Each structure stands twice: as structure tokens, then as C-alpha cells.
């Protein structure tokens, strides 16, 4: 598979050339088997700048969809409520009115 | 047909003929370089018998027993062929004049 | 038909063709630059670069016809006075 | 065990330490610079001597040198300080001119200069829309305040030029971002033989940084287009009972910003284009309240209620917000409408500005 | 002579002009004809405005 | 000053480091200036002040 | 139209390069995986009939993409379109060499 | 008056500067082209003493 190694919880996995006392292990610590973090897998190179703009900008979750419209409607509603309270309270304190 | 279109056509043909003129002049310089290498002037050949290039002409060569007398118009042994498929001559009058100029002047090497 | 002549440039083999040194821009180079900049601006906005229908050119030509209608209305209302 | 992720969620979920202390100190300095702008702006406006400009300019100078000095170490506190630094710069280069507008020109110049000298020396992101939106907004406000401060303007040409600058920046958006991203420009040769060299691998591997910079610049350009197309939309029509041509310019620019959201495809730019009607309703409401009307301000709240109602019915009924269920004649006709709106904006601009009443 | 001979004579004279000044013979784009036609359209704008303010006098 | 900044900054003074419509617009401006140079002569001489 | 066709053939060439790097990463792992090999069923696996035999990994560099990538240019130096030929020359020089 | 000697002088400078290629191609007496008619002349070749 992939060569596993011991790791402290929340940290890089231990380099295999090191021992358990050069890097610090206490009696009773919790160690997890994590894969070796070796490196990045060959980043893509495209030279057509139009293809380099459509390909490399897909890490955006940029689909509009029926799930951004819900956040827009909720934020629009809260904005309506706050601005109606602000308008009407400012109208009540800058005039004398019962509307 | 606009005159601008045939003007651009004339310009592209004259640029093509300019590149063929440069290539033909390169061929003429190579032919004259070979002829001047194999038939030097009658003041250089005092230094020939000393060196390692005195009795160099052998009976398999194209310049063997060719005794250099002088210099005149060597006829440029390359072809300069036009693939004349344009029958019924009514060609472009400037683009036809430069072809005749190149085929008449550059077809002969100078001295 | 009429047996025309396409644009040709052979190889040179001669020490003159390396000596041009001039930068002059044709119609084909400026049209190619218009096409590339209308493919990039339809490649960071529309996020598809097939260039079948370009909407940015539609919008920009719409506002340019707006300005042209302004200029023609000015030259029409100037000759009235 | 069966849910080992929640043990790996007890090493990430760290305690207090020095981790939260730096965040709290950063937020403390943000709050200091904000309230130090606000207090001394109120001092210089309501009643006060040169101390009011003095505190603002000192806060501005210290904030600019702190946002330019800490860039090599943190680069997140640096861009946060450089984001918050353009309120005291835009206050110090606005109050420091004596007089009053003849002072918004220097304010626009100061916020544009600070945006441009914080945008240039930057990594990939955090030179996001907050910088280039203020850059193009300051350039547009500068180009309107230039004509407003040197010459005479009848206070309708201001909104006319602001809506025109917003429309020019919004329409010609992605070309301006592709130019501002400094892309690896194409190599279109002459039809002779000046054969250019190939692109090196260094300028090709850097390209996914430049694509993110281009996306940030185009989001900022569209946001600045919306801000400029609402900053003059609020001055054409809220002063005192403007003509119906001003009503048509406001409604037409809002409808054009709504209809341009079918063209773009980044989600943040779609949200910024659709939010132009909302920012229009809120800005016209707060300009009718500060303009002492209170009779169409309730109508502005009603129009904002229609806007949030069409947002709600688009949200919970996903057959109105789906352009697949519509017809090809409907999409064709609404495209012709979207072209006709900004095709007819500039003749109405000339009708309202008075350019058929000079000749 | 025909029209095409006249166009050929004009083209060879313009190519000589582009030869001794631009120092190229390609004639892809010719800025010398651009300068000459720029000054000549200036003269055409002058004569068009002149006859325009002449027929303005017949109002 | 513009001669000196052209001298010791040898990238501004080489038009291969520019863009394809930028120098095209430079050509537009250099067409327009000596296109407009004759009607301004006609205005200044008063050639439209006799007809 | 020609740049759409060039995007299609760039997709095909990138698929060929992905298959080639997948085979080369199956047959030559990074020198830390091969401690986990000699237990499982893949230690003594390279027969002399398989196309990898007595071939050893020295490192990672630019394998030259054993696919062909040959254009059928048959014209006698007819000058090409300055943006289509530029894009094809940009494709035949950075996609014909696989990366590390 | 004035401003008509200056206008005519600047116009003369522009006319001379713009048409400075054909005029210098006629000054040196360049060997003028001999373009034939389309019907039937023969295009003559220049002698080897002028070239």
C-alpha cells in the first residue's frame, strides 16, 4: 500500500531515521498510524491561457446553484428586518409620529 | 476585385521573390567559393607548392585538368526553373516583371 | 478560376534574413490579438473558452452603439440649429 | 473505536495559549484605528481645532507604516491593517484640506494611491476585491470630483458620470482584469520569419497564481462597478424631485446590473451583480431619511420588500431560478432586452445632462 | 495603358518609398502611405468643410 | 527628463516590450495628429472667415 | 474552431501522458514504498516477458512521452495562421515532454 | 499677416517631411520601373552598367 509510520496526534508523522527518544515520546502517549506525508503529485502545466483559466480556476466551488440563493434570501431577509427597524425608529425619534 | 487586394498579392509575391533572390545569391556565392578554392589567382599559387595541397587534383574530380585562364560569367549550374503552369500569359504586370528580372540577371554568376 | 498566390516565406540560407530588426504590426496580428483578448476575457468570466457566442463583446458593442446613437443625435440636433 | 476523527479533533482544538492572543490583539488594533478615525472625524466636523485633523493624520501615518512594515513577517495582519488603513487615509486626506466637494478629490486620490501601493507588492490572494474595488472606486470618484471641483456642475452630471463610469467598468470588466493580472501575453509573430522563443517553464508554472489574481481583480472590478453605479444612482434622484429620466437611469442601471448576472459565472460576481438592486434600495432609503422625506422612504422600504420577496420566491421555488425550464424565445428576448437597456442608457444620459439643450 | 498598369506603377513607387525609408521590402504594413493619406484626409476635411460652409451660404 | 528615463531604463525605449494594440493606438494617434493639423490651420488663418 | 479542435487534442495528449505516468508509477515506486512490497503478492513479479525487466529506477526526470504527436503538415512552406500555428507550436513543445 | 507665414511654414514642413521618401527616391534618379502593358510588350532588362 503506502508505508505507514507512527505519528503524534496533531503533527507530522515521524521520520523513520529518528528513534522514539530523539523526537520525544513519553510513557503513556497516544500514537496513531499515519501515512508518510511524502509530497505533492506533479502539478499540471498548461500553456493555453484560456485553457489555463478554465482549468486552474475550478477550485472555486463556483457553481451558482439552488444553494447560494438560499443564503442570499436569508441575508436579504435579515437586512430587510434591520433596515426597517432602523428607518422606522429614526422616523419616530426625528419626528413625532404614530406610523 | 479591389486594387487593395491585388496590391497585397503583389507585395506577398515580391516578398517571396526576395527570399528566392537571397537563396539564389547564396547558391552563386557557394559556386564562386568552390571555383575560387579550386582555381586561385596567379599570385597565390606561389604558396601552394610548399604546403600539403600541391598535387591535389586527381582524375575522379569535376575540376581536374581545368587550367584557369581568367574570370567571366559562369552560368550558375543550378536550375532556376519556373513551374510554368500559368498558361495563356496575362499575369500580374509587376509580379511578372520581377520574375523576368530575376531569371535574367541572377541566372549568371558574375566575374 | 484565376490561379492566385498564397502568402509564402521559404527558408533563407543567407545572411540577410536574420537582419530585419523592425517591429511593424499588420492587420492579422492585431486581429489575432483581438481574438486572444476576447478569448481570455471570455475565459475568466464565462469560464468556457469555446467562443461560440461571446456575451462580453455583445455587451461592449451594446454600450458602443449607445455612444454612437449619442453622437448621431448630436450631429442631428446640431444641424437643426 | 469507531469515530477516530474526534480524537484528531482534540489535537486541532487547542486551548487558549498565545494562539488567540495574537488574534485578539489584531482585532484590538482594528478597533483602535476605527474608533480613532470616528471620534476625531466627529471632533473635526462638529466642533474642534486642528487637533481633530492631527489625530486622524497621525493615526493614518502610523497605520500606513505599520501595514507596510509587518508585511515580511505576518502577511495576514499586514493585509488586515492594509484593509483597515483606507478609512483613516480617506479621512485624513479629506479633512486635511481646508474648506468643505473640493476635499473628496484628495480623499479619492489618497485611497487610490494607498490601494495601488498595497496591491502591487502582494502575494496571490488578499489583494482581493477589497483593494482593487477601492482602487477603481477611488479612480472613478477622482475622475468625477475633478470635474466637480475645478469646473461648475449642476449636481446632475455627478450621478451621470458616476453611473457611466460604473457601466464602463462593469461592461469592460474581464478585459481589464486580464490586462491587470499581467498574464503571459501571446506571441503572435509577423508573417515574415521572426520566430519567437517558447515560453519558459518558470512563467508557465506560475500561472495558477495569476489565474487567482485575475479572478480577484475581476470580482473587485465588478464590485467597484456596482459601488460606482449606486453612488451616482443615489445622487441623480434623491436631491429634490428629479425628472423621470433620472428615474429611468436608476431603474435601467439596476436592471442592467441584474441582467448582467446571467453572463458571468463566478459566484461572488453574480452575488455582487444581483445585490446592486438591494444596495440601491438601502442607499435610496438612507438618502431619503437623511434627505428628510419619509413619504417615499416607506416606498423605498416597500421596494426593498419586493426585492426580498422575489429573492424568497426564487429561493423556495426552484423552477423560476432555473434557465433550463424557460424557452429559447424567452432567453433570446431577454438577451435583446439586456442589450437594449445599456444601449439606451447613454441617450437618456444625454437627455438628462442637457446635451440636447446646449445646441 | 490600363488601370492595372497605373496601379502597378503606384505600387512600385510606394515600394521604393518603403525601401529607402522603412528599410524593408516586405510591404505588409506601410506607414508611409498612412502618413500621406493622413495629410490628404486633412485636406479632404478642409475642402469638405469649405463646401459645407459654402452651401450653408445658400440657406 | 523623458530622454534620461529613456536612456538608463532600456525597456521603455524598445517597442518589442509593448502590446499589440498599444502601439496600434500609438499609430492611431500619429495618424490623427497630422490629420487634424490642416483644419486647425484653416481655423487659425481664418479660411472659414471668408465663406 | 481550430482552437476547439486543439483543446480536444490537448485533452487526448494529456490522457496519454496520464496513462504513461500511471504505468511508470506502478512499475517504479518511490524508494520508500518497496519495504511494504516484499510481504504481499508483488515481490518477485517482473517476468522477462513483461516490458519492464532488469530496468531500475534512478530518479524522476522528463520522460519524453513515447506517443507520436506528429502533425500532417504537407504544404510547401505556405505561411500559416499566426494564432493557430502559435498555439500548435505551444502544444508540441510543452506537452511532448512528460514532467518529473 | 503673421500666423499665415507660420502656418504655411509648418504646413510646408509637414508636406516635406511626410513626402520625404518618394521625393528622395526621385532625387537620386533611381532606375524607374518598366512595367509592361497586359496586351503584348516585352519586359526589357536593365543593362549591367547602371546596376
Swiss-Prot record, chain B:
Protein name, per record: ESX-3 secretion system protein EccC3
Residues of the full protein shown: 92 to 202 of 1325
Quaternary context: Part of the ESX-3 / type VII secretion system (T7SS), which is composed of cytosolic and membrane components. The ESX-3 membrane complex is composed of EccB3, EccC3, EccD3 and EccE3.
Localization annotation: Cell inner membrane
Domain of life: Bacteria
Phenotype of the disrupted gene, per the record: Deletion of the gene impairs iron-bound mycobactin utilization and EsxG and EsxH export.
Role according to the record: Part of the ESX-3 specialized secretion system, which is required for siderophore-mediated iron acquisition and for the secretion of EsxH and EsxG.
Cleavable signal peptide: none
From Swiss-Prot, chain E:
Subcellular location(s) of the protein: Cell inner membrane
Transmembrane segments: 39-59
Quaternary organization: Part of the ESX-3 / type VII secretion system (T7SS), which is composed of cytosolic and membrane components. The ESX-3 membrane complex is composed of EccB3, EccC3, EccD3 and EccE3.
Protein role: An ATPase. Part of the ESX-3 specialized secretion system, which is required for siderophore-mediated iron acquisition and for the secretion of EsxH and EsxG.
Recorded family membership: Belongs to the EccB family.
The protein's name: ESX-3 secretion system ATPase EccB3
Organism in which the protein naturally occurs: Mycolicibacterium smegmatis (strain ATCC 700084 / mc(2)155)
Gene name linked to the record: eccB3
Entire-sequence positions represented here: 33 to 91 of 518
UniProtKB/Swiss-Prot annotation, chain F:
UniProt-recorded name of the protein: ESX-3 secretion system protein EccD3
Similarity remark: Belongs to the EccD/Snm4 family.
Role of this protein: Part of the ESX-3 specialized secretion system, which is required for siderophore-mediated iron acquisition and for the secretion of EsxH and EsxG.
Transmembrane intervals: 32-51
Domain of life: Bacteria
Subcellular localization(s) per the UniProt record: Cell inner membrane
Disulfide bridge map: none
Self-association state and partner proteins as the record states: Part of the ESX-3 / type VII secretion system (T7SS), which is composed of cytosolic and membrane components. The ESX-3 membrane complex is composed of EccB3, EccC3, EccD3 and EccE3.
Recorded coiled-coil stretches: none
Record note on disruption phenotype: Deletion of the gene impairs iron-bound mycobactin utilization and EsxG and EsxH export.
Gene: eccD3
Amino acid at each position: 500500500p503506502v508505508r505507514l509510520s507512527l505519528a503524534p496526534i496533531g503533527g507530522a508523522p515521524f521520520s523513520l531515521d529518528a528513534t522514539l527518544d530523539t523526537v520525544g515520546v513519553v510513557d503513556g502517549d497516544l500514537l496513531a498510524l499515519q501515512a508518510v506525508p511524502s509530497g505533492p503529485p506533479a502539478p499540471r502545466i498548461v500553456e493555453d491561457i484560456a485553457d489555463a483559466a478554465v482549468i486552474f480556476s475550478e477550485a472555486r466551488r463556483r457553481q451558482w446553484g439552488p444553494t447560494h440563493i438560499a443564503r442570499g434570501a436569508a441575508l436579504a431577509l435579515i437586512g430587510l428586518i434591520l433596515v426597517g427597524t432602523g428607518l422606522s425608529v429614526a422616523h419616530r425619534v426625528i419626528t413625532g409620529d404614530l406610523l | 476585385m479591389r486594387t487593395e487586394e491585388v496590391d497585397a498579392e503583389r507585395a506577398d509575391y515580391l516578398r517571396y521573390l526576395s527570399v528566392v533572390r537571397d537563396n539564389v545569391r547564396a547558391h552563386a556565392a557557394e559556386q564562386r567559393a568552390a571555383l575560387e578554392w579550386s582555381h586561385p589567382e596567379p599570385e597565390v599559387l606561389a604558396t601552394i607548392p610548399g604546403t600539403r595541397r600541391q598535387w591535389e587534383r586527381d582524375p575522379r574530380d569535376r575540376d581536374f585538368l581545368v587550367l584557369r585562364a581568367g574570370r567571366h560569367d559562369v552560368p550558375l549550374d543550378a536550375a532556376l526553373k519556373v513551374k510554368d503552369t500559368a498558361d495563356e500569359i496575362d499575369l500580374e504586370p509587376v509580379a511578372h516583371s520581377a520574375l523576368r528580372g530575376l531569371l535574367d540577371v541572377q541566372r549568371t554568376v558574375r566575374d | 478560376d484565376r490561379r492566385s498566390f498564397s502568402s509564402r516565406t521559404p527558408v533563407n540560407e543567407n545572411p540577410d534574413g536574420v537582419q530585419y530588426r523592425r517591429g511593424f504590426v499588420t492587420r492579422h496580428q492585431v486581429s489575432g490579438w483581438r481574438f486572444v483578448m476576447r478569448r481570455i476575457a471570455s475565459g475568466v468570466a464565462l469560464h468556457d473558452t469555446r467562443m461560440l457566442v461571446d456575451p462580453l463583446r455583445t455587451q461592449s458593442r451594446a454600450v458602443l452603439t449607445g455612444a454612437l446613437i449619442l453622437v448621431t443625435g448630436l450631429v442631428g440636433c446640431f444641424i437643426f440649429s | 473505536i469507531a469515530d477516530a476523527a474526534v480524537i484528531f479533533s482534540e489535537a486541532r482544538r487547542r486551548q487558549w495559549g498565545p494562539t488567540h492572543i495574537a488574534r485578539g490583539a489584531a482585532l484590538a488594533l482594528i478597533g483602535l484605528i476605527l474608533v480613532g478615525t470616528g471620534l476625531s472625524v466627529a471632533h473635526r466636523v462638529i466642533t474642534g481645532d486642528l487637533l481633530g485633523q492631527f489625530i486622524v493624520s497621525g493615526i493614518a501615518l502610523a497605520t500606513v507604516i505599520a501595514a507596510l512594515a509587518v508585511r515580511n513577517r505576518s502577511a495576514v495582519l499586514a493585509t488586515s491593517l492594509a484593509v483597515t488603513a483606507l478609512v483613516p487615509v480617506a479621512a485624513a486626506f479629506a479633512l486635511g484640506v481646508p474648506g468643505d466637494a473640493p476635499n473628496v478629490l484628495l480623499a479619492a486620490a489618497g485611497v487610490a494611491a494607498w490601494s495601488l501601493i498595497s496591491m502591487a507588492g502582494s502575494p496571490d490572494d488578499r489583494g482581493i476585491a477589497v483593494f482593487t474595488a477601492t482602487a477603481v472606486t477611488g479612480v472613478g470618484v477622482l475622475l468625477v470630483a475633478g470635474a466637480a471641483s475645478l469646473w461648475v456642475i449642476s449636481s446632475d452630471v455627478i450621478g451621470c458620470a458616476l453611473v457611466l463610469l460604473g457601466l464602463i467598468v462593469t461592461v469592460q470588466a474581464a478585459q481589464l482584469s486580464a490586462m491587470w493580472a499581467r498574464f503571459p501575453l501571446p506571441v503572435i509573430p509577423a508573417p515574415g520569419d521572426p520566430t519567437p522563443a517558447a515560453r519558459p517553464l518558470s512563467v508557465l508554472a506560475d500561472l495558477p497564481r495569476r489565474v487567482r489574481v485575475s479572478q480577484a481583480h475581476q470580482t473587485g472590478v465588478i464590485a467597484a462597478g456596482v459601488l460606482l453605479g449606486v453612488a451616482g444612482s443615489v445622487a441623480l434622484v434623491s436631491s429634490a424631485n428629479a425628472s423621470p429620466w433620472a428615474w429611468y437611469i436608476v431603474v435601467a442601471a439596476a436592471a442592467g446590473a441584474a441582467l448582467r448576472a446571467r453572463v458571468w459565472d463566478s459566484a461572488a460576481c453574480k452575488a455582487w451583480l444581483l445585490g446592486h438592486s438591494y444596495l440601491l434600495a438601502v442607499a435610496l432609503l438612507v438618502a431619503f431619511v437623511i434627505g428628510d422625506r419619509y413619504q417615499a422612504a416607506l416606498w423605498a422600504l416597500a421596494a426593498l420588500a419586493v426585492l426580498v420577496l422575489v429573492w424568497i420566491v426564487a429561493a423556495l421555488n426552484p423552477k423560476i431560478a432555473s434557465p433550463d425550464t424557460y424557452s429559447l424565445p424567452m432567453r433570446r428576448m431577454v438577451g435583446f432586452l439586456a442589450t437594449g437597456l445599456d444601449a439606451s442608457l447613454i441617450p437618456v444620459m444625454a437627455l438628462l445632462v442637457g446635451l440636447f439643450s446646449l445646441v
